[PDB]
Amino acid sequence: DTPAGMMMKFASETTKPFVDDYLLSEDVRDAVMHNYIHIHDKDYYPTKSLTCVQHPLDVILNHGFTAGHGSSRPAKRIETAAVLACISLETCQNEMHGGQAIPAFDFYLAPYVRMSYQEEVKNLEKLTGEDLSNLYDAPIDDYIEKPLDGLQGRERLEQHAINKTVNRVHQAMEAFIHNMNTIHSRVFSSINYGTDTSAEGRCIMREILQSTYQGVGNGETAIFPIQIWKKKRGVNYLPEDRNYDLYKLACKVTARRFFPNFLNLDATFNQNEKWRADDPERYKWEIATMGCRTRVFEDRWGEKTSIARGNLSFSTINIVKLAIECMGIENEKQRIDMFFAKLDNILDITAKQLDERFQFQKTAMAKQFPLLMKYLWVGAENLKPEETIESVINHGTLGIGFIGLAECLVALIGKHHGESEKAQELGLKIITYMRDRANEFSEQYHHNYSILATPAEGLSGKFTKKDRKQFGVIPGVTDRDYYTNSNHVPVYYKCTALKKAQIEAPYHDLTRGGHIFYVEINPSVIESVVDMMDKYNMGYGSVNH
Amino acid sequence: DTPAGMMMKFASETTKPFVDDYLLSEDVRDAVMHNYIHIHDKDYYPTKSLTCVQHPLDVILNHGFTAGHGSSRPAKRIETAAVLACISLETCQNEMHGGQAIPAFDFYLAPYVRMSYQEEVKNLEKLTGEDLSNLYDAPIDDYIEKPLDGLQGRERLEQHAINKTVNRVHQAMEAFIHNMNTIHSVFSSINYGTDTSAEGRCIMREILQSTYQGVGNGETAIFPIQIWKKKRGVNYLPEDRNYDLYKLACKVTARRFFPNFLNLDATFNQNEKWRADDPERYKWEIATMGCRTRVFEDRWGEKTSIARGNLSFSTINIVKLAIECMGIENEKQRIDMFFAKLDNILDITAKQLDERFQFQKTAMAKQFPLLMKYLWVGAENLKPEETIESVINHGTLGIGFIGLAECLVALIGKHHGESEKAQELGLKIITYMRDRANEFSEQYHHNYSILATPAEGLSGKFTKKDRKQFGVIPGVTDRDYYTNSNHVPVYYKCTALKKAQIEAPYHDLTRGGHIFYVEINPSVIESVVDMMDKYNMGYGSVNH
Ligand SMILES: Nc1ncnc2c1ncn2[C@H]1C[C@H](O)[C@@H](COP(=O)(O)OP(=O)(O)OP(=O)(O)O)O1
Ligand SMILES: Nc1ncnc2c1ncn2[C@H]1C[C@H](O)[C@@H](COP(=O)(O)OP(=O)(O)OP(=O)(O)O)O1
Ligand SMILES: [Mg+2]
Ligand SMILES: [Mg+2]
Q: How far apart are CA B263 and CA B267, in angstroms?
A: 10
**Among candidates A7, A200, A213, which has minimal Cα distance to A105?**
A200
Instruction: Name the DSSP letter for residue B392.
Output: G
Count of all residues that appear for chain A in the document: 545
Task: Determine the atom of ligand 2 nearest the C-alpha atom of B215.
Answer: 14
Pairing status of strand A226-231 against strand A189-193: parallel
Q: What sign has the CA pseudo-torsion A480, A484, A490, A496?
A: negative
- Locate all alpha helices (DSSP H) within A413-496, ordered by sequence: 422-445, 462-468
Other CB atoms closer than 10 Å to residue B279's CB: what's the count?
7
Q: Any residues with Cβ below 6 Å from ligand 1, and which? A: A 171, 174-175, 178-179, 182; B 72-73, 75-77, 80, 83, 87
* Residue partners of B460: CB distance under 8 A and separation at least 6: B480, B481, B482
Report yes or no: A480 and A492 within 8 Å, Cβ to Cβ: yes
Residue B182: strand, helix, or coil: coil
Sign of the four-CA dihedral B481, B484, B488, B493: negative
Taking contacts as CB-CB distances below 8 angstroms, the residues of chain A near B175 are: 80, 83
- Residues A307, A295: Cα–Cα separation, whole Å: 11
User: CA A154, A155, A156 angle in degrees (round to 5)?
Assistant: 90
Query: At a CB cut-off of 8 Å and minimum separation 6, what does B421 contact?
Result: B412, B414
State the smallest CA–CA distance between residue B268 and chain A in angstroms.
Answer: 36
Give the Cβ contact number of residue A455 at 10 Å.
17
Q: How far apart are the first and last CA of chain B?
A: 30
Judge whether B164 is closer than 8 Å to chain A, CB to CB. Answer: yes
Indicate the helix (H) or strand (E) that contains B67: strand B66-67
Q: Tell me how far CA of residue B350 lies from CA of B24, B51, B52, B247, in angstroms.
A: 13, 17, 20, 44
Contact between B44 and A3 using a beta-carbon 8 Å cutoff: yes
CA distance A385 to A367: 6
B2 neighbourhood in chain A, CB within 8 Å = 94-95, 368-370
Q: Give the residue from B72, B185, B368 with the most A CB atoms within 10 Å of its CB, the best one to mutate.
A: B185
Residue (of B535, B489, B538, B490) closest to B516 by Cα position: B538
User: B72, A178: Cβ pair inside 8 Å?
Assistant: yes
Ligand 3 geometric centre to CA of B175 (Å): 19
Q: Count H helices and E strands in chain A, helices first.
A: 18, 13
Distances (CA, A) of A468 to A37, A319, A412, A481, A483: 17, 15, 18, 9, 12
Instruction: For ligand 2, atom 3, name the residue with the nearest CA.
Output: B179
By CB neighbour count within 10 A (0-12 exposed, 13-18 middle, 19+ buried), where does B20 fall?
middle
Nearest ligand, CA of residue B175? 2
> Residue A136 gets which letter from DSSP?
T
Helix B496-503 to helix B522-534 angle (10° resolution) is 30
Q: Are B399 and B349 in contact (CB under 8 A)?
A: yes
H/E stretch holding B449: strand B448-452
Helix, strand, coil content of chain B in percent (nearest 5)? 45, 10, 45
- Backbone torsions φ then ψ of A166, nearest 5 degrees: -65, -45
Instruction: In whole angstroms, give the CA distance from residue A505 to residue A431.
Output: 13
Q: For residues A191 and A228, is the Cβ–Cβ distance under 8 A?
A: yes
Element (H, E) at B200: helix B198-208
For B540, counting Cβ atoms within 10 Å of its Cβ (0-12 exposed, 13-18 middle, 19+ buried), the class is buried
* Angle in degrees, CA A530, A531, A534, rounded to 5: 95
Q: What is the DSSP letter of B219?
A: B
What letter does residue A291 receive in the DSSP assignment? T
**DSSP string covering B98-162:** S-EEESSHHHHHHHHHHHHHHHHHHHHHHHS-----SSTT---S-------SS--STTTTTTHHH
Measured in degrees and rounded to the nearest 5, phi and psi for residue B452 equal -105, 105
How far apart CA A483 and CA A486 sit, in angstroms, is 9
Give B320-323's long-range contacts (Cβ < 8 A, gap of 24+).
B320/B35, B320/B36, B320/B462, B320/B466, B321/B345, B321/B407, B322/B406, B322/B407, B322/B410, B322/B411, B323/B407, B323/B410, B323/B466, B323/B470, B323/B473, B323/B476
Give the dihedral of Cα atoms A209, A215, A217, A223; nearest 10 deg.
100
Residue B542: in which H helix or E strand, if any?
strand B539-542
B369: preceding bond cis by omega (within 30 degrees): no
* Secondary structure of residue B228 in the 3-state scheme: strand
> SS3 for B482?
coil
Gap from CA of B171 to ligand 4 centroid (Å) = 6
Burial A281-292 (b: 16+ CB within 10 A, else e): ebbbbbbbbbbb
CB contact under 8 A, B185 and A91: yes
Phi-psi region of A234 (alpha: psi -120 to 50; beta: other; left: phi over 0): left
Element containing residue B230 per DSSP (H, E): strand B225-230
d(CA B359, CA B24): 10
Sign of CA dihedral A384, A387, A388, A390: negative
Per-residue b or e along B40-57, where b marks 16 or more CB atoms closer than 10 Å to that residue's CB: bbbbbbbbbbbbbbbbbb
Q: Are B294 and B449 in contact (CB under 8 A)?
A: yes
**Number of other CB atoms surrounding residue B421 within 10 Å:** 12
B148 CB within 8 Å of a chain A CB: yes
Residues A335 and A319: their CA atoms lie apart, in Å, by 14
Bridge partners (DSSP) listed for residue A220: A216
Closest by CA position to B191, among listed B268, B99, B116, B266: B99
Alpha helices (H) in B316-460, listed in sequence order: 318-324, 331-360, 371-374, 404-408, 421-424, 428-444
E strand intervals along A237-356:
261-264, 310-317
Residues of A in contact with B367 (CB under 8 A): 1-3
Going by C-alpha positions, the residue among A200, A211, A202 that lies closest to residue A113 is A200
Q: Is A521 on the interface with B (CB under 8 A)?
A: no
- The DSSP symbol for A220 reads B
Rounded Cα gap, residues B544 and A51, in angstroms? 44
List Cβ neighbours of B213 (8 Å cut-off, separation of 6 or more): none
Measured in angstroms, how far is the CA atom of residue B171 from the centroid of ligand 2? 8
Q: Is the CB of B178 less than 8 angstroms away from the CB of A369?
A: no
The verdict on A524 touching B (C-beta cutoff 8 Å) is no
Residue B403 to residue B487: CA distance in whole angstroms: 9
**The ligand 1 atom nearest the CA atom of B74:** 16
Architecture category of domain B20-49+293-514 in CATH: Alpha-Beta Barrel (3.20)
On whether the CB atoms of residues A82 and A61 are closer than 8 A, the answer is no
Contacts of A451 (CB under 8 A, 6+ apart): A399, A400, A401, A402, A431, A434, A435, A438, A510, A511, A512, A513
Within 10 angstroms of residue A90's Cβ, the number of other Cβ atoms is 17
Of A47, A93, A186, the CB nearest to B6: A47
In sequence order, the 6+-apart residues with CB closer than 8 A to the CB of B222 are A69, B181
Q: Kindly give, in sequence order, each residue whose CB lies less than 8 Å from that of residue A146, ignoring residues fewer than 6 positions away.
A: A159, A163
Instruction: In whole angstroms, give the CA distance from residue B219 to residue B446.
Output: 45
Residues 340-399 of A with CB under 8 A from B: 365, 367-370
Q: Is B419 exposed, middle or buried (0-12, 13-18, 19+ CB in 10 A)?
A: middle
Sign of CA dihedral B172, B175, B180, B181: positive
Radius of gyration of chain A (CA): 25
The helix/strand count (H/E) of chain B reads as 20, 13
Q: For residue A347, give the nearest of A408, A395, A402, A298 by alpha carbon.
A: A402
B81 vs A468: CA distance, rounded Å: 55
Chain A partners of B90 at a C-beta cutoff of 8 Å? 184
- CA A174 from centre of chain: 22
Angle CA(A484)–CA(A487)–CA(A488) in degrees, nearest 5? 65
- Of ligand 1's listed atoms, the one at least distance from the Cα of B80 is 19
Taking the CB of residue A215, how many other CB atoms lie within 10 A of it?
15
What is the C-alpha separation between B104 and A343, in angstroms, rounded?
Answer: 67
Q: After which residues is chain B broken (C to N over 2.5 A)?
A: 185, 520
Contact yes or no for A127 and B156 at CB 8 A? yes
Coil vs helix vs strand at A316 = strand
Task: Provide the 8-state DSSP code for A389.
Answer: B
Distance of CA B331 to the CA centre of its chain: 40
Give Rg (Cα) of chain B: 25
Q: Is B167 on the interface with A (CB under 8 A)?
A: no
Breaks in chain A after (C-N > 2.5 angstroms): 186, 521
As a whole number of angstroms, the distance between CA A499 and CA A232 comes to: 25
Output the CA–CA distances (angstroms, integers) from residue B103 to A159, B191, B204, B523, in the order listed: 44, 5, 13, 28
Contact A544/A520 with Cβ under 8 angstroms? yes
Judge residue B153's burial from the number of C-beta atoms within 10 Å of its C-beta, 0-12 exposed, 13-18 middle, 19 or more buried.
exposed
Task: Please tell me if the CB atom of residue A69 comes closer than 6 angstroms to any atom of ligand 2.
Answer: no
Count the Cβ atoms, other than its own, within 10 Å of residue A34: 11
- Judging contacts by C-beta atoms under 8 Å, the chain A residues touching residue B67 are 182, 184
Q: What are phi and psi of B229, to 5 degrees?
A: -100, 125
Rounded CA separation A306/A317 (Å):
26
Picking from A4, A96, A160, the nearest residue to B94 by CB comes out as A4
d(CA A389, CA A380): 9
Distance CA B482, CA B405 (A): 9
Does A6 touch chain B if contact means CB atoms closer than 8 Å? yes
Which of B6, B97, B126 faces A46 most closely, judged by CB atoms?
A: B6
d(CA A401, CA A227): 24
Strand-strand pairing, A310-317 and A52-54: antiparallel
Give the number of the ligand closest to the Cα of residue A90.
2
Atom of ligand 1 nearest to the CA of B77: 19
> Is-cis flag, bond preceding B224, omega within 30?
yes
Q: Do A415 and A325 form a contact (C-beta atoms < 8 A)?
A: no
Amino acid symbol at A150: G
Q: Residue A540, exposed/middle/buried by CB under 10 A (0-12, 13-18, 19+)? A: buried
Question: Whose CA is closest to B86, among B52, B46, B55, B130?
Answer: B55
Residues of A in contact with B132 (CB under 8 A): none
User: Cβ of B73 under 8 Å from any chain A Cβ?
Assistant: yes
In sequence order, the 6+-apart residues with CB closer than 8 A to the CB of B378 are B390, B391, B394
Ligand 2 close to Cβ of residue B175 (< 6 A): yes
- From B361's Cα to the closest Cα of chain A, the distance in A is 15
Q: How far apart are CA B33 and CA B22, in angstroms?
A: 15
The phi-psi region of residue A108 (left if phi > 0; otherwise alpha if psi is between -120 and 50; otherwise beta) is: alpha
Using a CB cutoff of 8 Å and minimum separation of 24, what contacts does B331-335 make? B331/B411, B331/B412, B334/B411, B335/B411, B335/B425
SS3 B189: strand
Q: How far apart are CA A260 and CA A250, in angstroms?
A: 7
Which H or E element spans position B262? strand B260-263
**Does the beta carbon of A126 lie under 8 angstroms from any beta carbon of chain B?**
yes
**How long is chain B?**
544
Residues of A in contact with B91 (CB under 8 A): 182, 184
d(CA B203, CA B109): 8
- Which amino acid belongs to residue A416? H
Residues 266-295 of A with CB under 8 A from B: none
Angle, helices A78-92 vs A154-179, to 10°: value is 20
Q: How far is A186 from chain B (nearest CA, A)?
A: 8
> Between 3.20.70.20, 3.20.20.70, 3.40.50.720, 1.10.3720.10, what CATH number should domain A20-49+294-515 receive?
3.20.70.20
**Which atom belonging to ligand 2 lies closest to the Cα atom of B171?**
20
H helices of A93-153, where? Answer: 105-109, 111-121
